[PDB]
Amino acid sequence: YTGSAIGQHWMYNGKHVLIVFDDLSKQADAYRAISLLLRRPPGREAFPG
Amino acid sequence: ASRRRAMKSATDNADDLIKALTLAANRERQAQITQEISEIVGGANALA
Amino acid sequence: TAGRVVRITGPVVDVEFPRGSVPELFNALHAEITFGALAKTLTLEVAQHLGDSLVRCISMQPTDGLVRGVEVTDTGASISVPVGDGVKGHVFNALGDCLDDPGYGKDFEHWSIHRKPPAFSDLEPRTEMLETGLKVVDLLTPYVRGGKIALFGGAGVGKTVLIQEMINRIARNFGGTSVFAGVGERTREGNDLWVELADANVLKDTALVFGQMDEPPGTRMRVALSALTMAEFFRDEQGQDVLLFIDNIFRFTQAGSEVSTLLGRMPSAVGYQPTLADEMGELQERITSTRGRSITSMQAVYVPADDYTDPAPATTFAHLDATTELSRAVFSKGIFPAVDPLASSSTILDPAIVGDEHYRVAQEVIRILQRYKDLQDIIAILGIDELSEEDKQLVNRARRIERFLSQNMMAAEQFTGQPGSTVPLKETIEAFDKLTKGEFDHLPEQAFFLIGGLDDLAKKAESLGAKL
Amino acid sequence: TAGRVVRITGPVVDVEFPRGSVPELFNALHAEITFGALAKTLTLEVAQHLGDSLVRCISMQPTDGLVRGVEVTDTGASISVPVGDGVKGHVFNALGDCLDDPGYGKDFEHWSIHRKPPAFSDLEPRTEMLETGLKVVDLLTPYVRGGKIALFGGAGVGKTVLIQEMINRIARNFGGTSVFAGVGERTREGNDLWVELADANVLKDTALVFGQMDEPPGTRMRVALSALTMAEFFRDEQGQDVLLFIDNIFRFTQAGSEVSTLLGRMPSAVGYQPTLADEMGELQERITSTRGRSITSMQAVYVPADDYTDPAPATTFAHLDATTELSRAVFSKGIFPAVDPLASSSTILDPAIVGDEHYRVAQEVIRILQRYKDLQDIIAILGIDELSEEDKQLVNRARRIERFLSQNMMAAEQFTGQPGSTVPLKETIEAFDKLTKGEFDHLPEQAFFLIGGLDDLAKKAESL
Amino acid sequence: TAGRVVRITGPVVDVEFPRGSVPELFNALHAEITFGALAKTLTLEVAQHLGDSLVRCISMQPTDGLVRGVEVTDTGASISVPVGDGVKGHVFNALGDCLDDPGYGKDFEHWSIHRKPPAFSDLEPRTEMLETGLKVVDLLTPYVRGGKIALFGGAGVGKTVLIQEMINRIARNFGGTSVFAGVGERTREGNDLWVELADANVLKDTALVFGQMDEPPGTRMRVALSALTMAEFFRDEQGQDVLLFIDNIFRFTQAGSEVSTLLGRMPSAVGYQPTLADEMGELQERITSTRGRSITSMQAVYVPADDYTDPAPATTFAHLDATTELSRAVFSKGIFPAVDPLASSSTILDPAIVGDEHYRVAQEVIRILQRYKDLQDIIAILGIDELSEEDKQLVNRARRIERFLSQNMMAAEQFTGQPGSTVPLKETIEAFDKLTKGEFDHLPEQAFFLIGGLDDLAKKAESLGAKL
Ligand SMILES: Nc1ncnc2c1ncn2[C@@H]1O[C@H](COP(=O)(O)OP(=O)(O)OP(=O)(O)O)[C@@H](O)[C@H]1O
Numbered sequence A: 001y002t003g004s005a006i007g008q009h010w011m012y013n014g015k016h017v018l019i020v021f022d023d024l025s026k027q028a029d030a031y032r033a034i035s036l037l038l039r040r041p042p043g044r045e046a047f048p049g
Numbered sequence B: 001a002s003r004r005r006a007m008k009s010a011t012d013n014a015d016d017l018i019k020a021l022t023l024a025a026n027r028e029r030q031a032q033i034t035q036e037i038s039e040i041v042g043g044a045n046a047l048a
Numbered sequence C, E: 001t002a003g004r005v006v007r008i009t010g011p012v013v014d015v016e017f018p019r020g021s022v023p024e025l026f027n028a029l030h031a032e033i034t035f036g037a038l039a040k041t042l043t044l045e046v047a048q049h050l051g052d053s054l055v056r057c058i059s060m061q062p063t064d065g066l067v068r069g070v071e072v073t074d075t076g077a078s079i080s081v082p083v084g085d086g087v088k089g090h091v092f093n094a095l096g097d098c099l100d101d102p103g104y105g106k107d108f109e110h111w112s113i114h115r116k117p118p119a120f121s122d123l124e125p126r127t128e129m130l131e132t133g134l135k136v137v138d139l140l141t142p143y144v145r146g147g148k149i150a151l152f153g154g155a156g157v158g159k160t161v162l163i164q165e166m167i168n169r170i171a172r173n174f175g176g177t178s179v180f181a182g183v184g185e186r187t188r189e190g191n192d193l194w195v196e197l198a199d200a201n202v203l204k205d206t207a208l209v210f211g212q213m214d215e216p217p218g219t220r221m222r223v224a225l226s227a228l229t230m231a232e233f234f235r236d237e238q239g240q241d242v243l244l245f246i247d248n249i250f251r252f253t254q255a256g257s258e259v260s261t262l263l264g265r266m267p268s269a270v271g272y273q274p275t276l277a278d279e280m281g282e283l284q285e286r287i288t289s290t291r292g293r294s295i296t297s298m299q300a301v302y303v304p305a306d307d308y309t310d311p312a313p314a315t316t317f318a319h320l321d322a323t324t325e326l327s328r329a330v331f332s333k334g335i336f337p338a339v340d341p342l343a344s345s346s347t348i349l350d351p352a353i354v355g356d357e358h359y360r361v362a363q364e365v366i367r368i369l370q371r372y373k374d375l376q377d378i379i380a381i382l383g384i385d386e387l388s389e390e391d392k393q394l395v396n397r398a399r400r401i402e403r404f405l406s407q408n409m410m411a412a413e414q415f416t417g418q419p420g421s422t423v424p425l426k427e428t429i430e431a432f433d434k435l436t437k438g439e440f441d442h443l444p445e446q447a448f449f450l451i452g453g454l455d456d457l458a459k460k461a462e463s464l465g466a467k468l
Numbered sequence D: 001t002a003g004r005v006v007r008i009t010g011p012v013v014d015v016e017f018p019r020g021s022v023p024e025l026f027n028a029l030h031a032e033i034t035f036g037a038l039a040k041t042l043t044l045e046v047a048q049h050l051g052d053s054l055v056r057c058i059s060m061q062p063t064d065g066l067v068r069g070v071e072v073t074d075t076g077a078s079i080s081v082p083v084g085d086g087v088k089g090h091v092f093n094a095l096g097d098c099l100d101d102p103g104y105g106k107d108f109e110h111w112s113i114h115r116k117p118p119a120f121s122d123l124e125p126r127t128e129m130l131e132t133g134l135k136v137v138d139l140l141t142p143y144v145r146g147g148k149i150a151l152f153g154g155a156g157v158g159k160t161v162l163i164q165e166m167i168n169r170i171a172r173n174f175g176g177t178s179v180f181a182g183v184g185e186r187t188r189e190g191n192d193l194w195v196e197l198a199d200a201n202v203l204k205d206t207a208l209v210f211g212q213m214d215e216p217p218g219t220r221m222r223v224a225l226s227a228l229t230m231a232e233f234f235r236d237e238q239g240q241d242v243l244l245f246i247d248n249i250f251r252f253t254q255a256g257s258e259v260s261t262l263l264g265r266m267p268s269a270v271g272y273q274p275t276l277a278d279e280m281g282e283l284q285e286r287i288t289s290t291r292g293r294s295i296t297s298m299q300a301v302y303v304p305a306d307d308y309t310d311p312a313p314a315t316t317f318a319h320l321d322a323t324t325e326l327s328r329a330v331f332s333k334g335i336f337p338a339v340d341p342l343a344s345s346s347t348i349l350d351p352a353i354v355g356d357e358h359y360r361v362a363q364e365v366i367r368i369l370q371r372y373k374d375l376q377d378i379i380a381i382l383g384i385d386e387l388s389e390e391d392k393q394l395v396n397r398a399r400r401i402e403r404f405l406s407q408n409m410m411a412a413e414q415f416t417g418q419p420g421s422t423v424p425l426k427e428t429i430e431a432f433d434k435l436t437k438g439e440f441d442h443l444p445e446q447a448f449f450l451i452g453g454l455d456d457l458a459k460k461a462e463s464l
């Protein structure tokens, strides 16, 4: 989201941006860790809904 | 000669099938562990 | 009488009201976010009465920037959307606000998005075939005019391309009204649909409602109700034949699951909300055709992780007249549409409705394909060579049949540049009867791939060398 | 300012401190079990701040005999292990206590075991090769300096001899030191390793840190960090190359999972701790090259259900730079080290890193060995004579190549009087290039057994 | 000095008592439901002391109509059932009430159903064969007189039919007393068994105790204890051999699991109660023969979803001297009784007890069947013609052996119309010795299906066009 905001600032100013997320699997794992540490009931593969 | 070629092909196909079935079985094993933990933790949370 | 925010947990807000002023369930409350970039007016929908004059509500917009204790005002009524002929040709969001022309429809009659389904006495089964021109659908899963059609499938199997194909085939030459509900899908897909409908001159007949992915779960679970409200107005007030397209209803179910998790409800199997079937039943039962009033509804249903056993599609299955299941296995072979002929079904594929010849040909095709599926296990290891002569003949027939069920679709021209084809139902029945009999076994397999009727088969076979 | 035990639930202990004296997270607290039979000093590690001046800690020792209300003393710092050259040649536990000499090192400099990895700007941006001097490793599976090497092998395959050889080579060739981290170490095996290293005379160059199987999960979790801290001191303060051995890293992951379960955390997929990736990253990122010095790690990895997609091995392999598989099949042939040249692999066997000639020679060797493995079945059942002439030529060449991958190791000198050999990388490359061309196919097979470079090959050829 | 209902939730009831009047654990308490339609007297078994003078109890009857704050009376003792020779020839429920003659047995001696098992020093291994006349059971899973026998299987594999068969074969000519415990099974089956025993004249020697699957969980938990209490009285007081039949013992565990979560216990693996093994151990260790006092117990153990790894059957396995495991695969192959010869076991199947000949023949049969099981997949894919000649011979022998292990049972006539048969042990051993040597290889396999001894084999082979 930080990278996306940095890119969006340019994009909304008429610039062209290329953003690479290397990688979103680890972001999903981190978000699952945060959700579980908040005791949110998990779903498929222990991920939050 | 044709039998040798066909049996080599069949052995290769059986190896590929074994690999795919092992991958699917491991996915199922992990999913079963995850679902069992989900049910156990849901019960524990309900009794919390 | 105005309430105050007490708890904020994501898109779920707890609001305390003075005694004797607690809003009714589903009422629309309004709060204010004043922080500069995120300043807006939150619309909350009362979901639960928590006791002690506290209500739990689902925010239709992100709650970023909301502060505890801010004033909350009760509108006295649930969310309402504009209805009438004026909604046609315009794009709306879940709240009824026009997007292509802000402020439009504010003077229209406004209908609450929550209402009961038609009374059981008014329901009448629909058995009229809706010819499409697609060989696979027409032969094996005939659609029902005024019935409910669903397209199931995993990620990237052709649900949206098939929805576009059916919009092209059915909505273009349609004398009634059309309503499209984008539910938790790509925003750029909504833009593309808007532009394409404008180009085809179909927009003037169509009302578009969008609750796309980048929305809070409340909006994603209420946009379908808003679009259904417009469709219900067209059905019940104007006596119009109505076409309802929803992409994707699984996103409505998924948003419901997220909301339920936020509301603190105990999860059901696979983490889904306990009220999955109840919510789906309410929504789907509202999507129906009553006596003398026709709604032809077509819903794309996403299947998570290609798991057709998942509770969401499993519960969706029961609400449909025609079910077209798209299979990743079929998709991998290049067959388009990637329909699973054995898994798909239709309620009107019986001799009493489609006739004896159509039914017999369809049953023979299904039998051949099922036998091929059964033989797949042996074929994977040893190939077709160890099979009996009957089985070898059946396997060749089945491969040709499965290739011939594919078709060059009108909506596929964008991806291949090949214009699509329409096949009359009679020609489809005749061609598949000939194929099951064995009159094309000499032609090469590829001659049956991505073509229309028998003329196209003859041309392609001649091009490949075989004579026909 | 001292706390008191409020709740005891197995290795989980709740401690209440005065209002303004709550310890920091991961602080080490001390409590006393005074019962005569089980008398001891418990070290608790502050895991959570529960609020109202309560903290939740994991006991490093069994809590049997602990009483509610006993005084708990805050040490003011997390678990700290002794550092310096004095830790070499001695056996420690996860808490820094010396097992072979209680009280030893209590006066050394003590470093907290929780440390951040090197600053992003201080990391070496270019991968480097760790020239071990072993032909098989250098040619086929080169080790990354400051990298991570997985080790696979059952019993009786030479794994201990391989570890001793690596200790010897880091101490002698690189002038470095070694830290062994026995995670979930079997006490019998820990004692055996201690005695073996003492006999081989490499104990003086090694620091052993044992978190034993019969200890609560906390020590098994923290022993790896303890050993890593000793290695980090050797790298950063002494400016030495360090070789860190972890055995078994999966047991570190499983101890983390057990601790997470004990603290009431909701398990993630397949029951592992939610922070599995975070813990593995925190451990592994500290093993790198920085400021010209490096810690290279060789870690034994256990794969549950032989399922490489399992979260534990999947997370572990996100950090591994090389894999060395030890096979009983190679060992039975007498080829030492018993590294399976086809199962083993390295991520830097790439022309952009090792050079084009190295990659070409390695690929040729791998191709010859793979074809030999394919023809093995025909040889075994139909007989060698059944093969064509080209097949026989390739079988001879592959046999010579596979016997040449054997080497006379330094650790093997304790078994056979002959000392070890160190083959420079260029010599290995040119020798295997010549061998693949068939320029030594006429020599006897035994001439390629347990030797160094080409000079040793010629010397043994004249001896036959 | 009486309690009052405080909380009601399904079959679990919380009751508050005055100081010093808290009933002991397992005490039976009485409460009144006064609603006319559902008027009754609830019996509640104290399950937990919750503190603050509260006790959690399991209702033995449905709690519909129960009101908070109604008086609860403590009887001062556990549930007790009548004991004596008078219980023979009568049907009772879990509470000791006589169903076929209400009021009967109220003056008999009453024994509490909660009891400690026999002391370890009083236990004595049993190694005496109990011949049944069933080929598969007599050969591969020999039963033990005075030992513990179980019939494992999934739903509808023949557990109840085999239980009735063993009642026909063992109980009909039994000198001592029989006790049947219907535990959470079909009421229709209970009535059928009652009528069948009455017609066979075995009822006069049998005590029937029924708690059916329609009963609340408490009754299904305690009916096994009641029947076992009657059997224990017969064993210890009257000092006569006792036949004990339980069908289905798994229902005890299932009811325990049903009430576990409502009792506040955190669930164990696979949704079972944490105390599964301990409760099952208590109940099973009560079911045993002591030194000089014989109880031959036969139990039907339901295997959930055919999963023999399920914790319930897995824990039950340790409590049996002999286990006959019924397989769904064998059932679907049409082989009856559907005994899995490779999975079943008996502790007395060793040369010392059954003799060298019996043991050798059984081991040879098991070896042949194991090899056939190994070769089944190869036969399915590549066909039998690709097997070695010796393997072809073994496959033919194994098919004949597996067919011959099937048998027409006395209790199976109602399903096939064929009268049952009995085979002496010597004839069974001789026939399977001949089969394992290939002496009947020339006969068609169909000649070996659902017959008795070698005379039946010869007659059927002659009827099929072959000579034995
Ligand atoms: N009939 C077709 N002919 C050719 N290509 C096709 C056809 N249908 C789909 N495709 C290809 O497959 C892609 C995915 O199709 P589509 O977007 O309709 O799938 P979907 O099931 O709606 O996917 P998602 O789950 O991503 O929403 C299309 O972009 C196009 O690349």
Ligand SMILES: Nc1ncnc2c1ncn2[C@@H]1O[C@H](COP(=O)(O)OP(=O)(O)O)[C@@H](O)[C@H]1O
Binding pocket: D153, D154, D155, D156, D157, D158, D159, D160, D161, D162, D336, D337, D409, D412, D415, D416
């Ligand atoms: N290079 C070598 N030269 C001579 N003997 C060896 C060599 N490598 C291994 N061995 C022998 O093989 C055995 C391997 O045991 P060990 O070193 O404990 O490894 P592992 O734990 O795999 O068994 C040792 O006892 C050693 O004597």
Ligand SMILES: Nc1ncnc2c1ncn2[C@@H]1O[C@H](COP(=O)(O)OP(=O)(O)O)[C@@H](O)[C@H]1O
Binding pocket: E153, E154, E155, E156, E157, E158, E159, E160, E161, E162, E336, E337, E409, E412, E415, E416
């Ligand atoms: N020996 C047999 N011969 C023919 N049919 C049988 C035999 N045993 C069982 N069956 C069939 O299988 C069904 C299941 O038997 P039963 O024991 O009543 O169920 P369960 O195995 O669940 O206890 C019976 O109703 C009967 O139709």
Ligand SMILES: [Mg+2]
Binding pocket: C159, C160, C161, C185
């Ligand atoms: Mg789509």
Ligand SMILES: [Mg+2]
Binding pocket: E159, E160, E161
């Ligand atoms: Mg039954």
